[PDB]
């Protein structure tokens, strides 16, 4: 059949690098006719019941099944209704409306963890991903002696940055792997990915 069906798994992430809300969806059945997807939206208030100012439609590029709303069109720190509409020569379909505040779906990148510049000790230092430095963050640091049995040891609720952080109790292997990830403190947000593994050597 050819009627476009209601799209799904619609998600949006606020990209601080490009300062734009990026939304991606699942079209489904590969129709054999000239179809088109338009990311539609309007400013609203919490719970998205107040049909506010219409935000310019974002027409998806030809192959790509995603569109980006430039920040010049968003009102940060206020809710908005977003949905995608499929227009085909034989019908239309819409996705259920999503209700978010772009700042609640900010895509974070891992913090800058480094060995700083005592027996069985290590000194660390970390600063957050600069574009998000304005965000109060909380981080987890995970460490393990690099051995055949991958057992992760955690430190929770660490600050977004530390000039020098002395970690000790590291004598179970000559070298340890360390990673750190962060998340927005006290407000909605997703964890960042774990930073690339740091392989450091504990002072002998």
């Amino acid at each position: 059949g050819y009627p476009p069906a209601s799209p799904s798994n619609l998600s949006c992430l606020m990209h601080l690098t490009t300062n734009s809300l990026v939304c991606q969806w699942e079209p489904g059945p590969e129709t054999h006719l000239p179809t088109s997807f338009i990311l539609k939206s309007f400013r609203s208030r919490a719970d998205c019941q107040y049909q506010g100012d219409t935000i310019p439609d974002c027409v998806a590029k030809k192959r790509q099944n995603n569109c980006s709303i430039p920040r010049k069109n968003l009102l940060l720190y206020q809710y908005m209704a977003i949905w995608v509409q499929a227009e085909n020569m034989l019908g239309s379909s819409e996705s259920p409306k999503l209700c978010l505040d772009p700042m609640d779906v900010v895509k974070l990148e891992p913090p800058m963890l480094q060995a700083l510049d005592q027996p069985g000790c290590l000194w660390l230092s970390w600063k957050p991903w600069k574009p998000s430095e304005y965000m109060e963050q909380e981080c987890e640091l995970r460490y393990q002696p690099q051995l055949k049995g991958a057992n992760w040891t955690l430190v929770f609720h660490l600050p977004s940055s530390k000039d020098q952080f002395e970690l000790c109790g590291l004598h179970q292997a000559p070298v340890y792997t360390l990673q750190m990830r962060c998340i927005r403190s006290s407000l909605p947000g997703f964890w960042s990915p774990w930073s690339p593994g740091l392989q450091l050597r504990p002072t002998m």
């Binding site: 057992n151 992760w152 040891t153 955690l154 430190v155 929770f156 609720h157 660490l158 600050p159 530390k162 952080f165 109790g169």
Partner: protein, 171 residues
Amino acid sequence: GPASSLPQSFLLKCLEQVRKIQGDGAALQEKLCATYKLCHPEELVLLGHSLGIPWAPLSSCPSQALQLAGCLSQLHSGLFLYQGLLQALEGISPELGPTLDTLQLDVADFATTIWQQMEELGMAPALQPTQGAMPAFASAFQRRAGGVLVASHLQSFLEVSYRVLRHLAQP
């Protein structure tokens, strides 16, 4: 920084389990006093040695913050012990079976909860707590007194635990 080897969600749930159980033991102690006018554990003090009511220590808690494998380990052994003592009371009696069963399930799960957390973070000792030596409680009275005593010890154990946990919750 306010770092800690324990997640905060976990610590807050522990504090809530402590209160829930503290409220369960209070109900049990109320019942025993209402039903059998056995109201002052102090009066029964000497029967603890006589019956062999074990004691659960907490020696490893006011002296550590980012290294707490021993502290959780004890909290668990203790809760594990009282889980056994309450079981030994064989329900005390029909009137008390319900009240005590609530108390014992709540204590068992709190102990279980603590174990599984220790496993997840990689702390669980290879040695599972060799279940403590379990008391006799040979008569109705022994079960009734034993109950008042066990409840009294559980209570003291949880007051200390509450302080230890409350502290960890803010590092």
